[PDB]
């Protein structure tokens, strides 16, 4: 249960700055840890500043990237489905009754199955 209006566009748009700032923060903490260890090995007791362990931040960056990726994949699936439905199915959404639509769908499925069986028999006879 998310209830995000199912619209991916503004979601991705509003989520982009999160990726930006998270990348900024991870680069910052990485540079901090770098200067810390470079003062550790040869410097002195100077790096006294408890920062993030760089594990949680990087991993949550990966996780938000993951969430945006799955959202974009869902958006692509939705648009592709809309496209092919528009391309190979008439517009009847309450001018044909739903039983007629279901019957047409079943008939098309049967014709596709017949085509598939014909091609399979052809491949069999070939071999």
């Amino acid at each position: 249960q998310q209830q995000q209006d199912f619209d991916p566009v503004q979601r991705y748009k509003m989520l982009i700055p999160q990726l930006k700032e998270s990348l900024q923060t991870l680069m910052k903490v990485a540079a901090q840890n770098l200067i810390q260890n470079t003062n550790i090995d040869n410097g002195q007791k100077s790096s006294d500043a408890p920062l993030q362990r760089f594990d949680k931040c990087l991993e949550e960056f990966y996780a938000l990237c993951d969430q945006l990726e799955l959202c974009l994949r869902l958006a692509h699936e939705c648009l592709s489905q809309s496209c092919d439905s528009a391309k190979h199915s008439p517009t009847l959404v309450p001018s044909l009754p739903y039983p007629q639509y279901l019957a047409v769908i079943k008939a098309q499925i049967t014709c596709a199955k017949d085509i598939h069986t014909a091609l399979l028999d052809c491949a069999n006879k070939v071999t």
Binding site: L23, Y62, C83, V93, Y98, Y101, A112
Partner: protein, 278 residues
């Protein structure tokens, strides 16, 4: 519209958005093996960093996106789901919905590669290539008129053979008097110079123009004599119509200046350019 497919590319974009940062840390996974030539290796690091800018480009990619939304959300696809449990064992059809597409797409390649034919012979394996019924002419006429903004007419006052005339945005109408099936022996003129509606008394021939469209007429004759495929005359006349459509502008002038001659046109390669050069 069809801009949704662009989002697909965007997908790959964000894919790099992951890989990029990995390619960053992998580059930091090890130091200088043996430079021995320069310290651009470190710059190489920044090089990978440069590709991170690509991510910002992704945000820019949305500027061209989001043209407009279509009405009737969900596009009638989940209407089947609204059915009762009886309808749910139906997804198969949707699968075929893609499959059929793949089919076409497959043919889209297959037919393409069918272009390189291997018919070592075409005779001594059998007929009546001339179309018997005087109704397929009307069929081809209707198929051509299905094209928009390009009107076609025909009267055939000579006899069994086909006679037709076509007009375009300009007054450069084309009169094609050919046999039953395939187009041959046509001519072109401009600005009522032919007037093949009631020229003199009928659709006259007059075999003339003021030395401007003559080259175009010869080129069209050549195209007719060259596109004569052994079968599928409908494909032939459709190709002829598409070829004729390419002169609706007569504006550009590449690979030369617009002063070489009276005009410029010879597009059998699906692209017009300066004539007298091919």
């Amino acid at each position: 519209g069809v801009n949704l497919e662009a989002f697909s590319q965007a997908i790959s974009a964000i894919q790099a958005l992951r890989s990029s940062v990995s390619r960053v840390f992998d580059c930091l996974k090890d130091g200088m093996r043996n430079k021995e030539t320069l310290e651009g290796r470190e710059k190489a690091f920044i090089a990978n960093f440069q590709d991170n800018l690509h991510s910002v480009n992704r945000d820019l990619n949305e500027l061209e996106r989001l043209s407009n939304l279509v009405g009737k959300p969900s596009e009638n696809h989940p209407l089947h789901n609204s059915g009762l449990l009886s309808l749910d064992p139906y997804s198969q059809l949707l699968q075929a919905y893609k499959w059929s597409n793949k089919l076409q797409y497959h043919a889209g390649l297959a037919s393409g590669l069918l272009n390189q034919q291997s018919l070592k012979r075409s005779a001594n394996q059998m007929t009546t290539l001339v179309l018997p019924p005087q109704y397929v002419d009307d069929v081809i006429s209707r198929i051509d008129r299905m094209f928009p903004e390009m009107s076609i007419h025909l009267s055939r006052p000579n006899g069994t053979s086909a006679m037709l005339l076509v007009t375009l945005g300009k007054v450069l109408k084309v009169i094609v008097v050919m046999r039953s099936l395939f187009i041959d022996r046509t001519i072109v003129k401009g600005y009522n110079e032919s007037v093949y509606t009631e020229d003199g008394k009928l659709d006259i021939w007059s075999k003339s123009s003021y030395q401007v469209f003559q080259k175009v007429t010869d080129h069209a004759t050549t195209a007719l004599l060259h596109y004569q495929l052994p079968q599928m005359p409908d494909v032939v006349v459709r190709s002829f119509m598409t070829w004729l459509r390419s002169y609706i502008k007569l504006f550009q002038a590449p690979c030369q200046r617009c002063g070489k001659f009276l005009q410029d046109g010879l597009p059998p390669t699906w692209r017009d350019f300066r004539t007298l050069e091919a």
